Amino acid sequence: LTACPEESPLLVGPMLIEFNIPVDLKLVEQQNPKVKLGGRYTPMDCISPHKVAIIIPFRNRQEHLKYWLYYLHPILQRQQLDYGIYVINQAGESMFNRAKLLNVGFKEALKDYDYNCFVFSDVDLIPMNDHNTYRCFSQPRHISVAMDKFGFSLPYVQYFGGVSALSKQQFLSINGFPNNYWGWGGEDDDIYNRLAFRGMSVSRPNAVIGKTRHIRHSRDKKNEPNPQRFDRIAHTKETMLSDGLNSLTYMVLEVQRYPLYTKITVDIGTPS
């Protein structure tokens, strides 16, 4: 077998993405027979150099996940990636911690396979163009650059929210993501700050092929705006060395392998 082409020859470009249609994971599993237990997929015709672990922070978003799975699997296969889906479900009813869950994802996924690339994605963001490859690049990759919720514009040039990708080494070089951001906001700016502090830059696809749709939803109880985010992000320089991968603690309560993804339910503690 030879190395897959640089550009998948299966891409179709723009696609129609809509969320008023109800979904059935059974049909999805059927329509994607190539996807193995735990939502694992490995190209058959060639050797993909992208061993992608796709991490999804999660709690009470089953319907969104449904759409996410319905749309992404077909796309990730067309992108010729050797990938796996990880839904990191936060146990309990305490404050949501997106960044911490992503860290857990990084660690737990590595126990399964020698992934060298990590895509961190909100459960509610779907790419509108399969040319927007869910893989890693020479530099940290911001993937959801043109969100319809922001009218296809980047809210500000340093925005790193939504969907992003870091290679194993890029992730490691910044001591991962912070674990101290409880509730909504700022964790993505901290991560951006970490990348810059390590002397890295953000790579992005152009605003056309980077178009993506957000599933409209209301706010979630237990993920209210974090009032401390403003000055927490103003101090990333001093906290990234001690807050991150090296200080990550958590308890996996249960691991379940479904046909389209692996669900890891974890106790990641509470704000202190």
Ligand X SMILES: O=c1ccn([C@@H]2O[C@H](COP(=O)(O)OP(=O)(O)O[C@H]3O[C@H](CO)[C@H](O)[C@H](O)[C@H]3O)[C@@H](O)[C@H]2O)c(=O)[nH]1
Handedness of CA 153, 201, 243, 105 (dihedral sign): positive
Binding mask 46-65 for ligand X (x = CB under 6 A): ----------xxxxxx----
Tokens of 1: 């077998």
Q: Is 223 in the site for ligand X (CB under 6 A)?
A: yes
Pattern 180-209, binding to ligand X, x per CB under 6 A?
Answer: ----xx-xx---------------------
Look up residue 164 and give its two tokens: 């992003």
> Rounded to the nearest whole angstrom, what is the least distance from the CB of residue 184 to Mn ion in the complex?
10
The phi and psi torsions of 246 (rounded to 5 degrees) equal -65, -15
Residue type at 204 in one-letter notation: R
Interaction between residue 161 and ligand X (CB under 6 A): yes
Name which of residues 210 to 249 contact Mn ion (CB under 5 A): none
- Specify which residues 146 forms β-bridges with: 211
Q: How far apart are CA 243 and CA 79, in angstroms?
A: 34
Binding mask 120-139 for ligand X (x = CB under 6 A): --xxx---------------
Please indicate if the annotation marks 57 as binding a ligand: yes
Burial of 158 per CB tally in 10 Å (0-12, 13-18, 19+): middle
Count of CB atoms situated within 10 Å of the CB of 3? 9
The residues that touch Mn ion, with contacts defined as CB under 5 A, are 124
Binding-site positions read 57-61, 96-98, 123-124, 184, 186-189, 217-219, 229
The residues that touch ligand X, with contacts defined as CB under 6 A, are 56-61, 96, 98, 122-124, 161-162, 184-185, 187-188, 220, 223
